[PDB]
Chains A and B, each alone.
Chain A
């Protein structure tokens, strides 16, 4: 880990040049030293505040929502310094972290970040209040290149099917909870009870991790299969029978 810290009370111009320092080091290590670099940029909202300050100092008029008009170009300059390249064995994965102001996904910073990046991992206030760690919401979250990230020889044969079935069962479990809120526990069917059970155990075993619990992706998939074995083979409609016959048993 190479750690660049820009404290809130440090110069905002230093805040501006911090991500460029980090990504220059990442480019050196990845495209010259040929090692896969993960760049974790924390508080792009604070970076945007520094950018706003520098624009005002330049005496440029505020743009949308008081932010610079070129903030999209600046955020693109930061983010797009990432990815694999031809003829080099290194790469730069990026995980910018944003503090959505007022929890408004339409705010310029998260909006342009979604325009430039390739996914989002949502941290849910509801889960945080329910005291689940990590409070990552998997329904609104997305990773466009999960299909490239997973598969045989990269993670495992059944990663995509397990992930899809887990998402489907989780959404159905939330729906069944909403329905139970109206009809009552008795009116629910056996499949509804199974879905509620899977929802509970998925938020208690899959999501709920603990700060210092390092799960290899194989452990993650084993937990996912433990949760999927709540249901019989038939209700797992999103897992091909070829994969169910191999990983469902036990």
Chain B
């Protein structure tokens, strides 16, 4: 509600001033954290746009290498799809840190369990080898893209949470403490006024009693 409901007092005023300063400091630190997260988020966004543009060419080159492969090797797609066995390229999870937020990323890692060797032993040969290299390059691009997008989503969520924290503070908590401090100041003024009235009344009565004695 409007007030914290701490009874007016000088001790209460000191407590509320300390709490207001602490809330402001926490708001500033969370704002700095949000600024760092947003800077990294926009950097990753620009990197994502650039990587998408570069994929626009790498994927095209790989697809054309495949088209050339089909020129010599023939219809090797069925053989490629049928002989799968075990993946030669796997991924390993990695951790990245931005402010206090951990950003998941991926590692491009090889197994070596090749299964398409000799695929163009007689006719494909060079074209299929080049195609393999081009699609390995494309996978190298897309693993970086995936790491960027994972970090991007995590940063988006963290930025939203931290901005929500900062807004909650500066729109709910700080106004509450400011209202409490204003009320405490008003009530202490009222106490001073009442004490002044009592002392003035006592002084008037003392003067009247002195006159009575005189």
Contact = CB atoms under 8 A, between A and B. Distances in A.
| A–B contact (CB under 8 angstroms) | yes
Interface of A: 59, 61-62, 64-65, 102, 104, 178-179, 181-184, 187
B13 to A, nearest CB: 9
Given A178-B29, A178-B32, A183-B33, A61 B97 contact: no
Contact of A62 (B28, B29, B97, B196): B196
Top-5 shortest CB links A-B: A182-B33, A61-B199, A183-B36, A179-B32, A183-B99
Residue with the highest number of chain B CB atoms closer than 10 Å, among A102, A178, A182: A182
Given A102-B14, A187-B36, A182 B203 contact: no
Contacts of B123: none
B203 A59 contact: yes
Interface string B43-80: 00000000000000000000000000000000000000
Interface in B1-21: 10, 14
A182 B196 contact: no
Contacts of B97: 184
A136 to B, nearest CB: 21
Contacts of A183: 32-33, 36, 99
Nearest to B188: A65
B86 interface: no
B200 A61 contact: yes
B112 interface: no
B29 A181 contact: yes
Nearest to B10: A102
A65 to B, nearest CB: 8
B185 to A, nearest CB: 9
Contact of B36 (A59, A62, A64, A182): A182
Given A182-B29, A182-B32, A183-B36, 12 more contacts: A59-B203, A61-B199, A61-B203, A102-B10, A102-B14, A104-B14, A178-B28, A178-B29, A179-B32, A183-B32, A184-B97, A187-B36
22 contacts: A59-B203, A62-B195, A62-B196, A62-B199, A64-B192, A65-B192, A102-B10, A102-B14, A104-B14, A179-B32, A179-B36, A182-B29, A182-B33, A182-B36, A182-B99, A182-B100, A183-B32, A183-B33, A183-B99, A184-B97, A184-B99, A187-B36
Nearest to A63: B196
Contacts of A61: 196, 199-200, 203
Nearest to B17: A104
A93 B18 CA distance: 35
B14 to A, nearest CB: 6
Interface in B168-214: 192, 195-196, 199-200, 203
Nearest to B197: A61
A62 B202 CA distance: 13
Contacts of A179: 32, 36
